Design a binder for this molecule. Sequence first.
Ligand SMILES: [Mg+2]
Ligand SMILES: [Mg+2]
Ligand SMILES: [Mg+2]
Ligand SMILES: [Mg+2]
Lengths: 138, 213, 134, 149, 61, 67, 101
Amino acid sequence: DFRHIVRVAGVDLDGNKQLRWALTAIKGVGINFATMVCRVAGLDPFMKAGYLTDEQVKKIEEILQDPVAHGIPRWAVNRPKDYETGRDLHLITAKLDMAIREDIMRLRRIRAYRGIRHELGLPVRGQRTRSNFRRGQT
Amino acid sequence: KPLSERFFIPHEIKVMGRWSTEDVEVRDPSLKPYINLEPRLLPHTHGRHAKKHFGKANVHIVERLINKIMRSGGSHYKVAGHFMRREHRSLNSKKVKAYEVVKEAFKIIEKRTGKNPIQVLVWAIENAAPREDTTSVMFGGIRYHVAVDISPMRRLDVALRNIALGASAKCYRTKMSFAEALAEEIILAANKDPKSYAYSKKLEIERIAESSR
Amino acid sequence: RIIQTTGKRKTAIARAVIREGKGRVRINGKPVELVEPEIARFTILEPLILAGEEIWNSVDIDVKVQGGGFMGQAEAARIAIARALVEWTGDMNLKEKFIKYDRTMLVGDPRRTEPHKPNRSTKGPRAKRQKSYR
Amino acid sequence: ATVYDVPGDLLVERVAQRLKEIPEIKPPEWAPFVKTGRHKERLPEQEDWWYYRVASILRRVYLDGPVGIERLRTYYGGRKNRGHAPERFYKAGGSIIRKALQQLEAAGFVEKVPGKGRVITPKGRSFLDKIATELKKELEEIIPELKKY
Amino acid sequence: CRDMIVLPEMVGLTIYVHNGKEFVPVEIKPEMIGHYLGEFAPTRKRVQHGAPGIGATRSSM
Amino acid sequence: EGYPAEVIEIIGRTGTTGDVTQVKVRILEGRDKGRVIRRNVRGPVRVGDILILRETEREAREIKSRR
Amino acid sequence: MQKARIKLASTNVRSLEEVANQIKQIAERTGVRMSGPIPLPTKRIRIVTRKSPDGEGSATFDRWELRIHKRLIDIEADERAMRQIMRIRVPEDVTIEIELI
RNA sequence: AGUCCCUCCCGCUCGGGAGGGAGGCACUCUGGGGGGACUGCCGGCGAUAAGCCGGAGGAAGGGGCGGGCGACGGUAGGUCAGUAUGCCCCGAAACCCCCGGGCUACACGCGCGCUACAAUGGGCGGGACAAUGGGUGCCGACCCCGAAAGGGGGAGGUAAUCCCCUAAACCCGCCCUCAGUUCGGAUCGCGGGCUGCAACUCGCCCGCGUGAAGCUGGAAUCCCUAGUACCCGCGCGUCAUCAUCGCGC
Ligand SMILES: [Mg+2]
Ligand SMILES: [Mg+2]
Ligand SMILES: [Mg+2]
Ligand SMILES: [Mg+2]
């Protein structure tokens, strides 16, 4: 039965890895999210990924497109109170990129302060610069 | 591990409760009166000796071995090429892990042959302590290299240090663990093999000592 | 009859208790046979292993100790058991063989720690900063 | 044959199994989605991460008399690794221990002494030292000094 | 009062601020509510360096 | 190869860094077995140890009267 | 009865034992028991400060110190002893207080 | 601790254990007074001297171990920006207040340190023992509301009494195995709190995401003689709040 590659929500992963791990490869999901979706699907968190049929990971993605609708709570989701519609959302590879750039373009639209350090490209969270972050040349 | 041992009970005054020193033999007489062999079950003395002159002569040998691996290695004189400054993930003062690892190492020695491990240490530290080396003497305002003979105790201590260093050099970021990394040293030292390390340093010291006699 | 014994090593007091009995010995609730720092479980058996298994067939002993660390309680307890066994039977040879194997099992420990100094003040009297040219 | 006489994790592991029946005790509904405190860095790994905790809370107070909450959040913490910075001690989370002692009282092993802390009932002492004795009743097979005491 | 937090009142409007030597025009748009007032009035002019001089390297002391 | 000789007197310490030691010892066996010679040794030594040497004819070079 | 318990606390260690044994004597002088003086944890306060006014030179440090002595004495309540403990006229650098349990 | 009652468990109990209360200060403790080592006895030089060698005896050995005290004079070194202080200055101002911005800017040179470059490990969870100091503007035992941050009631304390306080390296079971990875956790996105007359420039914590340089380091130089050096935590100064610092443990 063994396959060595399982493709779920876009990017695949090997079938030789513990199932809680290898899903790490989807940009926007780490460990301490992973065990959650695992335990709310109802499948072992240790099994070697090479043991997955189809309809299971179908459910997996299904949860992956609405964690809150099934028990995953509202204080570990990838953006709570979505500034365009406060709903609870957890995003993935395809669409996080879009979000980061739109939320940059926001402050790029109003000429606030915070944008200036994305534009002029130096730290934003109030370090100093007179000793470190020397990233160019002599 | 297994609880048959995890809890242990001795009624025999030995070392480590597994082996004892009654019949071993050091051949080389220059080292004879300088290797303690009294029972001394617990190899731990709390430095009540390195205060008066020539005090450290009488320690049971396994203790002098166990302390002399509490090392990141060498940190100001290169070894095998690289430096091995490992700091804060060391074993500097943590004698517990030292006792434990040396226990496992002795049991591994006992397996792959089946003999008194400490006698095997006896063969080992007999063949890595050289018997000459060099200095510089002042003769007339001009000073230069010469050669002289090494006193026993220094033979002893250089021997042990080189063994420890060697074994502590085959494990650097290596699948091989530290324990058998020890055994593969005492073994080779007892087999005077060139591929070993402790034998290397005795050979390469005496060579360049006789190169400039 | 009963006798009571003490000893101190790096701020770890040890009160021993002895009396006639069967051959069991505890510490702070612990039976001796259950001590995970085996390199400690050997730090207190030695006056119980030189005395012979036979004197170790007639005694009830429990110790109360406190202060210091898990390698510091062991030697205070050892001092306890020894200065006890030396009064229970209190003959002379059994002080004899307790001299050859080690000394400070009897003569008491003078080794005491040290202040710190006002140059790093967080390491020790003799580890200063690192000097500065240029 | 009281608990002072046996190694810890043995008795702990032991009681942790047969504690599966008491219908008082079960994992609450924020069980799978929570790390236990400000000194965890990963989640609970093994499955019976509930029952072990309930048990090892049982063992504590028995040989410890009167105690409460603010201190049990002070045994169950660990050195956290705060980023670039050195390491520092911390206390842990509480809501766990709270629901825990709720369901454990409701079982009936313990009872609340007002203003002074908590204690263990008879039921608890007998239930404990029973399994204590059972455990010593086979370990003694293979180490012959558990006989004498 | 640089620490105003704009509201349904002012969206669209035009007030000033103070930035260290002057008053400054800030005109209002949506998306500004939630921010402060002063956030939009910079305080330290940027720096466009000249060239190193005397001493800046240990050859020149 | 293995020749031992026995230390019978320590005479002084030479070497630009205070390391060698003037020590008049006796050979114990061999084609000589009884001739008492002059050598400098490295390490610490006590009157009464058993030293190995390897040439039995080197006759180390004299000191400035030990003082 | 009621175990009135008096107190003492001073800086000059010498000038305290004087009145301690004074009360010891009187409580002995009349016929009534008295518990020996109970020594208590000596008290210390440590204050260091940098010995240099400016910031140049190496930094050299002082250690000022002041130890506070406490004692304790329990006596019965015999009014014939109450009256003697009222004519005490203590030294100035000692403080006494009386409170019965 | 040894005696005595009461009360509670266990192989049902012959023995074991553990909680209170009444008695004792025997034992640790707290601290004032006391005794305690003098090259003293011998062994060897060195004059036979002053001395150093030695070995006994002993809790300690030949300044018993660690700290306080710093002579004459300098050093035109330092500080009038802690207080004093001669002269010259400003004197409706170079005086005294308030609301705002600044010391926190940024191609780069260097000093002192923290986290690492994984097996002398990382992660889960069980199992062990510490010490100096501090408390009424503050410390806070205990109980219920939160996932965690915290909030809510607040008993008890001005001190060997109640509180800050059940450290960590440590041990044992499971997962990971030569990898820029389960090493390393920068850097940025959201969202929930704290103190504060006031948190954008410019305070602090926590939940989820992303996952940067980094594979032990050239010529040079630095720190250490015994409970010392190394490694792991804590308490104070600072202080309405934040410790990668000094200072003790
Ligand atoms: Mg000047
Ligand atoms: Mg500045
Ligand atoms: Mg990591
Ligand atoms: Mg800010």
